[PDB]
Amino acid sequence: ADYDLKFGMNNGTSSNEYKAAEMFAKEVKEKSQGKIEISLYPSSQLGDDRAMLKQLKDGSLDFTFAESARFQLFYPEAAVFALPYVISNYNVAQKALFDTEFGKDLIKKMDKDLGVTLLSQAYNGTRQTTSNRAINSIADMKGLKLRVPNAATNLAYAKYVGASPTPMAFSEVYLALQTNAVDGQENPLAAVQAQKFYEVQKFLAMTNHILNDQLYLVSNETYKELPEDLQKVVKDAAENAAKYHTKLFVDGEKDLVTFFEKQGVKITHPDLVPFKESMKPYYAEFVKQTGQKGESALKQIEAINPHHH
Numbered sequence: 001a002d003y004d005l006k007f008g009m010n011n012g013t014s015s016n017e018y019k020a021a022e023m024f025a026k027e028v029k030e031k032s033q034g035k036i037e038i039s040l041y042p043s044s045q046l047g048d049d050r051a052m053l054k055q056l057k058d059g060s061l062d063f064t065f066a067e068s069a070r071f072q073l074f075y076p077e078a079a080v081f082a083l084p085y086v087i088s089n090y091n092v093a094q095k096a097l098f099d100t101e102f103g104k105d106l107i108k109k110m111d112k113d114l115g116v117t118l119l120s121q122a123y124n125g126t127r128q129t130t131s132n133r134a135i136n137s138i139a140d141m142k143g144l145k146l147r148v149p150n151a152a153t154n155l156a157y158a159k160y161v162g163a164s165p166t167p168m169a170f171s172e173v174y175l176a177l178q179t180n181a182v183d184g185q186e187n188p189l190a191a192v193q194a195q196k197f198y199e200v201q202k203f204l205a206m207t208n209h210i211l212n213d214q215l216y217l218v219s220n221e222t223y224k225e226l227p228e229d230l231q232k233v234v235k236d237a238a239e240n241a242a243k244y245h246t247k248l249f250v251d252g253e254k255d256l257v258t259f260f261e262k263q264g265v266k267i268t269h270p271d272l273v274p275f276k277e278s279m280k281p282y283y284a285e286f287v288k289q290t291g292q293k294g295e296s297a298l299k300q301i302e303a304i305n306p307h308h309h
């Protein structure tokens with residue numbers, strides 16, 4: 001094609017993210033009259049999300065996904081998006097990004113410093129905790145060998161609840177669970193399904209601890225080369241795909257608990273009051289480390305009412 005573009009992702013071919021990326025690719029190909037073809041590179045073929053963000057910056061990959069929170073790697077205050085229990089729901093996540101001074105500035109910096117254009121934002125589920133033994137209360141976390149991604153906020157979730165974290169890439173998790181090298185992991189329900197973690201985890205606990213969004217990002221080096229009518233095709237397709245993406249996750253959350261039960265998984269509902277209490281010293285450490293910018297980001301986010309209006 002005139003533009004042989006590539007979209008890298010960590011998720012696999014059975015995931016909601018992949019299905020939404022397929023919708024995006026199809027719409028772009030059709031509405032560009034075949035000028036643009038987007039090929040998909042799932043399952044961390046190209047590296048993890050940190051690697052893929054570098055590749056968008058240098059123009060060697062055209063599209064990828066990232067969470068708003070992942071930008072903590074560059075702007076420490078952006079950890080606010082994944083401080084456990086701070087962002088209440090997706091309504092808050094949307095407003096935090098697009099309707100705060102903090103979030104608007106972040107989007108501008110992503111364009112200036114990191115070489116990426118934000119096309120759209122979707123919901124990517126609320127993270128829960130799976131394990132090889134029951135989590136009936138916070139006490140069961142103590143010393144649980146909890147896999148986390150290579151992200152400071154997830155590492156802190158594990159530490160402050162009393163678990164023993166083991167960071168590793170997403171691709172490595174199924175093996176680690178299967179062999180009981182670790183005792184559990186934490187991810188939204190849809191990823192537990194997509195990766196078939198239910199095959200290698202007998203328990204799931206509704207810890208509700210981190211809210212994930214999902215940004216459709218394009219390399220500036222690619223986006224600048226597209227004539228403006230094709231930029232519009234891409235932007236509009238990303239917005240349409242993100243609405244579909246969100247819907248896939250909202251519907252999965254409704255029924256996935258009963259899917260897992262049918263697969264033999266035992267679901268627990270630990271009391272979250274001590275989980276939330278356990279994060280208070282972590283918030284204090286975030287404020288100490290990130291200073292006025294972090295205090296401000298917190299304040300701006302805590303001011304957002306979570307009810308749709």
Ligand SMILES: CC(=O)N[C@H]1[C@H]([C@H](O)[C@H](O)CO)O[C@](O)(C(=O)O)C[C@@H]1O
Binds near residue numbers: 169170214
């Ligand atoms: C956009 C993206 O790549 N998301 C990935 C996230 C983030 O890397 C992580 O939450 C840090 O931001 O980690 C996973 O949930 C995980 O490894 O468990 C896989 C998911 O596909």
